Symmetry: D2
Subunit: 498 residues, 4 copies
Amino acid sequence: VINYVEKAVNKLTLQMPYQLFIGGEFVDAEGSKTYNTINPTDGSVICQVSLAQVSDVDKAVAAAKEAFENGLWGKINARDRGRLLYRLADVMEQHQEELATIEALDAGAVYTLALKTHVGMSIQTFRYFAGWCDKIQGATIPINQARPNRNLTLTKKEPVGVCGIVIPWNYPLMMLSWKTAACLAAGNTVVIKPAQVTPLTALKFAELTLKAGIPKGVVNILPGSGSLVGQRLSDHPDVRKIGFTGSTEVGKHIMKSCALSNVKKVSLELGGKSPLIIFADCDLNKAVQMGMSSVFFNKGENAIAAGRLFVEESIHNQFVQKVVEEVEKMKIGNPLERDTNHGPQNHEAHLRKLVEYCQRGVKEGATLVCGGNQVPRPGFFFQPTVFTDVEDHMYIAKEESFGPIMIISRFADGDVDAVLSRANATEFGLASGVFTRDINKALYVSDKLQAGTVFINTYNKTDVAAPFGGFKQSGFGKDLGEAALNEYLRIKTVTFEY
Amino acid sequence: VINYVEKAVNKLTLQMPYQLFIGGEFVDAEGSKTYNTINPTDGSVICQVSLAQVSDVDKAVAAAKEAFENGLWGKINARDRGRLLYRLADVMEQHQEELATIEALDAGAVYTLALKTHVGMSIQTFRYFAGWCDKIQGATIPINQARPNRNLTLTKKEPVGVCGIVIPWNYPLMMLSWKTAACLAAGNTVVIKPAQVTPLTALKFAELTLKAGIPKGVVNILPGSGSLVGQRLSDHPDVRKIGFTGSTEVGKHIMKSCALSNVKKVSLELGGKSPLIIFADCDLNKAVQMGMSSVFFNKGENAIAAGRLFVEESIHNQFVQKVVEEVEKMKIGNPLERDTNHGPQNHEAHLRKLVEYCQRGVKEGATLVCGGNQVPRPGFFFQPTVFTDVEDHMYIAKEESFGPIMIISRFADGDVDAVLSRANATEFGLASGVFTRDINKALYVSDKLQAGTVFINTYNKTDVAAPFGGFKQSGFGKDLGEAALNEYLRIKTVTFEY
Amino acid sequence: VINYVEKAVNKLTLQMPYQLFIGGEFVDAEGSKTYNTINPTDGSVICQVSLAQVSDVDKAVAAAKEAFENGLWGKINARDRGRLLYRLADVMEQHQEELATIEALDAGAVYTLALKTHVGMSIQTFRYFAGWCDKIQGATIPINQARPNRNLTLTKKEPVGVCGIVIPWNYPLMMLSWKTAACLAAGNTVVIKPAQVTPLTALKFAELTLKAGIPKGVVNILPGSGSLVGQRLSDHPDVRKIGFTGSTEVGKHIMKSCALSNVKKVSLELGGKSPLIIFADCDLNKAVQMGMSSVFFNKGENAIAAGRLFVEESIHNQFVQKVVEEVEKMKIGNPLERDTNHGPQNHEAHLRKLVEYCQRGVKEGATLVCGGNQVPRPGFFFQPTVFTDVEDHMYIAKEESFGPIMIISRFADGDVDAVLSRANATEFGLASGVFTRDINKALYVSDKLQAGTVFINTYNKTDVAAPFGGFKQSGFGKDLGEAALNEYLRIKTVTFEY
Amino acid sequence: VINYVEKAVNKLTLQMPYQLFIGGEFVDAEGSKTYNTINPTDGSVICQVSLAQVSDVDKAVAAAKEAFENGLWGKINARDRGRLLYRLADVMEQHQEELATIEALDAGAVYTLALKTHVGMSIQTFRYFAGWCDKIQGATIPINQARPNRNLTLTKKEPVGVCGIVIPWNYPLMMLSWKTAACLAAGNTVVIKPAQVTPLTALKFAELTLKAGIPKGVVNILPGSGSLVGQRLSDHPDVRKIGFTGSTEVGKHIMKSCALSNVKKVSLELGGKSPLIIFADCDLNKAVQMGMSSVFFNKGENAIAAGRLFVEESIHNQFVQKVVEEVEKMKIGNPLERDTNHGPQNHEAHLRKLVEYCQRGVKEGATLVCGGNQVPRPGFFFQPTVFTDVEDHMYIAKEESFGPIMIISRFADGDVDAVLSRANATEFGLASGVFTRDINKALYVSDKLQAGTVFINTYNKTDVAAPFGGFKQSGFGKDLGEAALNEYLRIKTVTFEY
Ligand SMILES: NC(=O)c1ccc[n+]([C@@H]2O[C@H](COP(=O)([O-])OP(=O)(O)OC[C@H]3O[C@@H](n4cnc5c(N)ncnc54)[C@H](OP(=O)(O)O)[C@@H]3O)[C@@H](O)[C@H]2O)c1
């Protein structure tokens, strides 16, 4: 029997585990230490959650090690590993409303969006990678023959072993799911560190692995701090790969920590300052809808959010007027209410950061067209914000806000290479977008953009089959698609002479 | 007009460039600094070689950056890039006797072996990767459709950009070629740091890039120290990928440096303590021939060399007797002499390490059956060495010798899992081998060995098409094969709505 | 409501549709023509089944064409097509005992075997191919650029369209499932002709597609004759691909019919005379167990059954002794008796062929060691049979029996190429096998065997992920594995200039 | 020494073999039978060429069989096979002017075009496929494990063996090269039947295989008739695959013949009636140039030639005007004259068909704007032709001309699905094209077009890396690209238990 925090909300009863998940059981942290998780809608404490200590990390890694080396997970057919992950996705679907509601409470996710994206895409992710298990294939290779003898050379794709996954707070279940589904499908075992501020869906997911019959120790979850828990995962001699999503500065530190311990493999999904280039020959009303979406989706807490919009001179003013018209129609409120389409920011410190970010924008000479402030109501709501007259040297032209802040610059009519240059003048390179009806411009622009994803006449169109990853200081390695598996597999070459 | 060090040897007139190669020209280092490269056959100075400074690294990177962004290399068809690399291989083949002679002088590589392997495989490498250029392909992906609209998702494989390659001294031209061929085939430009002690074939290769018509700046080569030149490559803000082959300790430092600068991509080919398991049911005389080769090939200066031989109890004594018989037949001598089987070690400091290594093996109680000493003659020759009665706790059971030292332990008749455990009890995992006529043993052992390559009834059978790389602290990423290309490519996802 | 033949049997009340399945409806054939399906355990009529006429084929093709061109199946996401095929597999699993009982009744499949193989593998097949739907990918190709312009070349994998599937009677549901799963996973629609003698699991399967929510017209099933129904499918101007499994002679006719109509695509899975080579260095008792299985599995009604065993001279006589001992232990009987090892042959005409086949083997000089005749009892049971002293020129050395008839020839101790020659001297090429503990023999023999599958130290080890298909007159194209999809997809090259 | 027909022409001395090429030597046919090859520029006899008989086919097939089974080609490394094919391409390049001149004489190919395309692309083809030799790889597959035991499943890609290649006369050397390069790269040997009317570049190519060191019997070439030589190839019991390019009706007969003999594999590249849809929003002047090329390239003797142009109402008249202006500037003349851009048709019988085709076009009511007639001069020249007012029911809207006849229909402004229906209302499906600046329209049209290739804002843009093949009655299988290899390879599955 598991201890839950119980809550009647959104026409259901939430049953939320709040403890560490180690070796298939929910347990207190060392010293029974706890911390509070905070509801961003009203600022209240949802509940106390166990605070993992170093010895808890070591227990989790040891359970993952044992599950990998001696447990059933390392012994079953790849097909049967697939079946378990497809069952896990089924169980998640059976609990979809509950997961989405927990995500609304914990992260401020608008419930209707959480159901479709945070949760819906997580379910798709497990089903997708479950199908990869018995389709992961090595090669046979026509090497030169040591005559008069013969040679056969094959490769075997094997699991990397014990993995550590460290994730951010913006889509807690979804980021967990993207990386965990690939990690498990490849036959690995894992210790997961959710962001300290958003532990709840991770711990509920942990319970769901029990319902799905995932063997004990295959999945371990440690709410706790990056500087303590995340650090120990990166340092651990028995961890063989870290999958990381978060800030560029933390990613640098993780990669360093991987190097200094045992050269564990690492993948990094880092920040973004993604440019969206909107040409005069686009469909304007549709550009407004998708442009707003590119920024405001999930209250801007989205690594691929367009952090910079370049709008062609002749449509700029009309674009801005229409955006302001639409912004005014947005319903800001409780993420659980059906009319809400803009929820609170994830946590208080992040709201403060956004208020300061916009002050700096104003101070440096950008035009604040609307928003810029906290919404005067309980919780941590921030106004959808539009800046114009943004110049390339400005702080807000360079820094990732990670909030609902549209940052608009003009470019001259007929210019193409000039705007590309400005769009590429960043050490980030996660995503980018272009709106145009012109086939030649679209294809040329997608070639020239220095970003791991280019959207054409859409934005935020991620898919579980489409690889997602950055260039330059946005990191390396892919989440999603077949390519994600390569971060969680090793290749063994076997060469016979006969 | 290029300055050469001319030398009449091996019935040839060598013409050896000795300067830095930057932007298609041979130039002195800053302040005309130089150092001596030493011939290991007699300890003499071959010539002075330019000693690259930080400002020279910056010039080479600048030249690589310009060549990639604006030069011809970034504009030609993939097919035509391939043509140029196939031409480069042809030029290398036209110069193969000269290259192999230079390698004999610089590295002590036995000339007949240098023709076939050091140079022969280098030529194969460029030809192989030249064939990949117009066969590197992305994907089109059946993503969910944003109804009532449609979506197309494709990926493009793009070059990573400016790369740094840092290599060791054991097969100077060949290690350069493995990495450089894959790097260029993927459309990158490069700055190469050969091992300071072995710059000569790299500088002659540089001249061959001119003869093949490789555009200026595509290939830059900087003889010099890792702590200065290599370090600056790892730190440089314009370098986007480092490809590294060398020790585990330098590998850690390189990876950390990649992290702290701009999270440039890194791949690591590190040390090895590769086990070879020889069962009583093997072909014994064959096991002797290949067992000796597994250790003594290229005077043991071979990252995948078997660093432990485990020999089944019932054949152990006969195996050792037969090895000693064959060892006595090996002809030690000048690498340029046709009857030479065993050349000198690469440089003096390494010879010193090997002497100390074997002193320690004797101190700790292993049976020295033969060799262990510097051969009494000029240069840095080391006697082929056999140790028996090696126990798992011993230093020589754990430490990589990187020399011609066969390190033998017994295992009990029938003890498969037990010998496997001992073979895997290392933080290395580069290679491994098994000799047995029994199909079931061979397949089971190859599954269980924790190494990037498993040889079965053979050893040292590498091939330009078969990926080569380690697990655990032997690093990550592959050289050779299609898999090598993945280190030198990035994936851009392009998603349309229409 | 659907009309059923109801039968209380095996603790179940079977509900068996008996009509044609066209456009989601069970309907009588033209003129309400019917035929009898016969129970092989007692020779009784199970029920009457609709007998499809030409106009019925045309209706089925029209329904498939409409389903493909305008129906939901052609509009849903690949992922959602995947979900439907998974759900179909789930429905089949929910009905597995019923399906296995129907197969026991209709084909004489031993119930315990039918559960695990006939039905169990069918379920695995749909689950496997369901996972491929959203992982079918095209390419982006680095073509030469039409300078000063640019080119993008991609491929799209598309369905072929309306398919016809014609299958035999040996594993009715399983052969249906192999082909249909790959067909549907690739996005096609289909008309299936089950063998006339075995229509019942196909018709129950049809009903399961309704329960699973497969759109109307996606699957159509027409019990009836090859010469009428199968012929019209091969001739039809709107059918674009035929997938065929059956005899070599009908395969020739089918391929010819494809040519003469509209050059529709064709894949052919035809006869076998598969050689099993058993060396003296094998595990003998295991060779007896697997050698028996290689012949007797599914009462020999198995296209890959070993049609000749070559047994090395020195073990031949002991091998035969052990086989005879084991053959005597086989329990022949009603497929529903849980201890039955050997069920009846599929239908009466096949039993008669087997009696004649054995009369001919004795006539031409082979030694009948055991079996060779009908078992005296109701139904169509044939004795597990062993022939020795079989020589290469003999009819039974050349002709496929498709029955439980072990056909043994000696080969000389220590010859390998000579036995390989004899094993390869056939125009069939579907499967083959080798038993040996010697790795060198096993690898060499597997290279040299001219057959689409080579088993090593096993037999009949098919897998839904492992491609299955013949060489020479055993046909071409694969069922199962990723390779199977290629028969059901077309490649569209799309080339832009911009 | 080889007998040549010598000819001084185009500032060269041509040396043309004229005999059968069998087992590495030029030999007379049975009975020394010969026939004349005709120069289409003036109708004169170029020379006499050996006329292969049935016994000659049997000799060629026996030579191919021996070369495959026992010769060097079956033994060498895939890498060394690649080297020979690369060397073959170099020899072709060394002879490119001579080959282009021979093709000018034999096929009427304009010399400048012959050099760039007929010959230039043939060289690219051999170099491209040479690169595939050591990159053709099978798989290792994670099948279910027969516990308590283990399984390993791998695939081996093997050659199909002896192949027959039968080709048309439109690009004699190029069609030879497309198929032969893929065939040889996959390790097969071959018997080639050039079109009887165009044997000369094939025979010269045969000589070049000798210069390149291709082992005897690997390439065999038999000038002769399809009804005799081609038929025997399709019938032969030792031929295992036919690669065919030609008419749909001969394709059907070839496939039938493959079926009736030994179910040899077959690929078919058949006719085309390829639609080109030109929207009003395209670049009109570029549409005229590329529209011109789509029809008139290689005097229309081009399987993928646009056989219908659909031009949007509002630009139709202006398009026709501009086309007529450009047609008038075409210089008709001797293919060896540098100012010629429209050469003669390939042979007299084809000229006759083109005359009859346009007579019928006029009879049935289409508007003949220009041409339609044999040019008054010696040889077989045909006036570039433009028809307008072409209606869907008309013979010339349905039947492939394979000549320089532009066939134009209107479609209403803003119609998309309507013109697609009309473009798709054909049993052909080889190529197609769309000109538009609208990205949404271009992508939608490319989805909907029922053809193996879709060109967007270009035409005739083939590439050796881009697969080329038809749908429906245009055949199946690809030439060019990775995909082409699959027609010349078989997959062997090898499954171990251990
Ligand atoms: N590229 C993508 O796929 C993607 C997706 C989502 C977010 N992001 C990026 O993430 C950033 C926003 O999240 P954030 O600012 O909260 O990121 P962050 O500070 O880098 O935190 C990410 C995770 O790393 C942990 N961490 C901190 N120090 C660590 C250490 N020394 N060792 C191991 N782990 C450590 C954090 O723990 P704590 O809980 O203690 O903070 C957290 O769980 C943005 O820049 C955004 O673009 C990127």
